[PDB]
Amino acid sequence: KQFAVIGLGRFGGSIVKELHRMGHEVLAVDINEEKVNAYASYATHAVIANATEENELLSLGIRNFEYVIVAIGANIQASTLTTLLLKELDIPNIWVKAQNYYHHKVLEKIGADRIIHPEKDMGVKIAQSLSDEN
Ligand SMILES: NC(=O)C1=CN([C@@H]2O[C@H](COP(=O)(O)OP(=O)(O)OC[C@H]3O[C@@H](n4cnc5c(N)ncnc54)[C@H](O)[C@@H]3O)[C@@H](O)[C@H]2O)C=CC1
């Protein structure tokens, strides 16, 4: 029902723009307001928070998003700690972007419903499109 994207880089911000362009409402959170301000026009609600902190997550109300996406970047701990925190919030679905075989492997066992490798996955998606192209 609900969609929450944590981390507004090229990936996360993109998935926030699309869900908007598709007519869905999104909660878009990040730690530096520059980012939050950059998507205020696309998110049904854009907030400034540190998703690694227990309390900010409750003032976020994340407890009620069927889907949450951890699209944080070059910072692996925040990523996992965040996915770890909310994993304990009982979020039915948490998808996380990954960049490490290591990272992937921990997320895997932490209980992440879906791990994403933009580069690898986009890879298969294209080979896919090539075959389709005839
Ligand atoms: N998703 C991941 O865990 C990882 C990604 N990487 C790689 O790092 C590269 C850099 O990617 P970008 O998206 O451009 O990274 P980036 O540093 O530009 O953006 C990450 C975003 O998440 C935001 N954010 C929101 N809440 C945060 C919090 N509590 N702590 C930290 N950041 C928070 C940051 O402020 C920022 O906008 C990527 O291409 C990715 O492949 C490397 C390690 C982990």
Curated annotation (Swiss-Prot):
Catalytic subunit of the KtrAB potassium uptake transporter. The 2 major potassium transporter complexes KtrAB and KtrCD confer resistance to both suddenly imposed and prolonged osmotic stress. It is a peripheral membrane protein. The keyword Membrane applies. This is Ktr system potassium uptake protein A. One of its GO terms (cellular component) is plasma membrane. Belongs to the KtrA potassium transport family. Keywords: Cell membrane, Ion transport, Membrane, NAD, Potassium, Potassium transport, Transport. Homodimer, tetramer (dimer of homodimer) and octamer (tetramer of homodimer). Part of the KtrAB complex formed by an octameric catalytic ring of KtrA and a membrane associated dimer of KtrB forming a potassium channel. GO terms for molecular function: identical protein binding; monoatomic cation transmembrane transporter activity. Its main location: membrane. Disruption phenotype: Impaired potassium uptake. It comes from the Bacteria. Residues 1-116 form the RCK N-terminal domain. One of its GO terms (biological process) is potassium ion transport. It comes from Bacillus subtilis (strain 168). NAD(+) binds at R10, D30, I31, N32, N50, A51, I72, G73, A74, K97, A98, Q99, H103, E119.
